Amino acid sequence: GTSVKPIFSRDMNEAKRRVRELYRAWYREVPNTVHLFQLDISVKQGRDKVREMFMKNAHVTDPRVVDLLVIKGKMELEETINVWKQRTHIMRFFHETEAPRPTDFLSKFYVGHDP
Amino acid sequence: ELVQVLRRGLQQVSGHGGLRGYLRVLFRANDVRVGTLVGEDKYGNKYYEDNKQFFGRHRWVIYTTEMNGRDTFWDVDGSMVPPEWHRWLHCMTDDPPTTKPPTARKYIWTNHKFNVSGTPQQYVPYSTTRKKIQEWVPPSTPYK
C-alpha cells in the first residue's frame, strides 16, 4: 500500500535500468570532458570520480528517490556537455584546496570541540 | 558682435592678475572664468560665485596650493573643503559661512583634515572592548 505515485519507475528494476543508462552516458562523456575543459586529470580519474559519485547513493531503496537522483544526474550531464559549466565547476568535485579533515577521535580532540 | 566676445576674453585674462596668473588658473583648474570672491578659507581656499552662470557653475572654489602638510599645486581633491564651505559649495544653503557662521563648540575640530587614505595617518580598525575571560594565574612558589 502506502499509496504513492511514481515519477518514472514502478519498481527498483526499472530504476536500476535508468541508473545503468545514465552511468553509460557519463562514462562515454568523461574523455570528451577532459579534452574540452583542458583538465589536468586523467580519464581514469574522471571515471573513478563518476563511480564514486554514483556509489555515494548506493543505499537508496526508494524508486522515486532513485528517479529523482537520475533526473539530477541527467541535468548535470546535460550541463557538462553543453559547456554551461566551466572548469571550476568540474574541478569542484575533487576539492583540491580543501585540507583533509581527520576522522579519528584523537585528532578531532586536538583540533577543537566539534565531533 | 565677435569683437565684444574677444574683448571679454582679454578682460578675462586681464582680470586674473596678468598673464601668469591667467596661465596658473588655466593649468590649475582648466577654467579661466572671473567671479566675485565670496570668501576665503583658513586653509587658503578661495570661494567665488557668479549667479549668471547656470545652476552648477554658479559657485566654485580655487583650492589652496598648500594644505596641512602636502603640496596641492596639482594634487587637489574635493575632500579639502572644510564643512562650512562644504555646506555652501554643494548648495545645501544660500548663506555663506562668512555671513552665517556655524555654531561654536569646543569639541569641533579646529583643523580640517582631508582624506588620509593610503597614508601613515590612515584609519586602522580594531576592537574597542576589553578582555572577556580571565585565566587563572598559577602561584609563583614551588608546591613541594
Binding site: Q86, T88 | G56, D75, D77, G78, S79, N115, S117, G118
Partner: protein
C-alpha cells in the same frame, strides 16, 4: 646621480600617460552601473578626464565592479579580469562589490569582490553618487602618480 634623475623623469612621464588615459571596461552588474552611466553623462562627462569606455578587456585598463557579484558570475568576472593586459586596475564600487552589502548573508553572493580579484580603490555607497565615483577615479589617478616602477628597477 644622473641615472637616478633620468629614471625619475621617465617614471613621471609614464605615470602621467597612464593616469591621463584610463580606459574602463564597459561592464556593469547592478544598480551601481546606473550611477556609472551618470558619470559618463553631460553633467560629469568622464570623457573630459581622458576616461573612455571600451568593451574589450584587451583594450581596457580599469575594471569597475559596479554591482553585486554572485557566485554564478564570479568565474566570468575573474576571467575578464585575467584577460586585461597589464598594467590593470580594479575599482570596487558600491556596498555589494565592497563587502556584499544588503546581500552579505546570502547563499548566492560573494562577500566582496576582493575575494576574487585584487582591488585598488573602494568606493562606498549604495549606490555611490556619480560624484563619489568620480572622486574615486581621481584618487586612482593620484595613486598611479605615486608609483615608481623605474626607480625600483634601478635600485635593484
Amino acid at each position: 646621480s644622473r641615472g637616478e634623475y633620468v629614471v625619475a623623469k621617465l617614471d613621471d612621464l609614464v605615470n602621467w600617460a597612464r593616469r591621463s588615459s584610463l580606459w574602463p571596461m564597459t561592464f556593469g552588474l547592478a544598480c551601481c552601473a546606473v550611477e556609472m552611466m551618470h558619470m559618463a553623462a553631460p553633467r560629469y562627462d568622464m570623457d573630459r578626464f581622458g576616461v573612455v569606455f571600451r568593451a574589450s578587456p584587451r583594450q581596457s585598463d580599469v575594471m569597475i565592479v559596479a554591482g553585486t557579484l554572485t557566485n554564478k558570475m564570479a568565474p566570468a568576472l575573474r576571467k575578464v579580469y585575467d584577460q586585461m593586459p597589464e598594467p590593470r586596475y580594479v575599482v570596487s564600487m558600491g556596498s555589494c562589490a565592497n563587502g556584499g552589502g544588503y546581500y552579505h548573508y546570502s547563499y548566492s553572493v560573494v562577500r566582496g569582490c576582493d575575494r576574487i580579484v585584487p582591488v585598488d580603490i573602494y568606493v562606498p555607497g549604495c549606490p555611490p553618487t556619480a560624484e563619489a565615483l568620480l572622486y574615486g577615479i581621481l584618487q586612482l589617478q593620484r595613486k598611479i602618480k605615486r608609483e615608481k616602477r623605474l626607480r625600483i628597477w634601478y635600485r635593484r
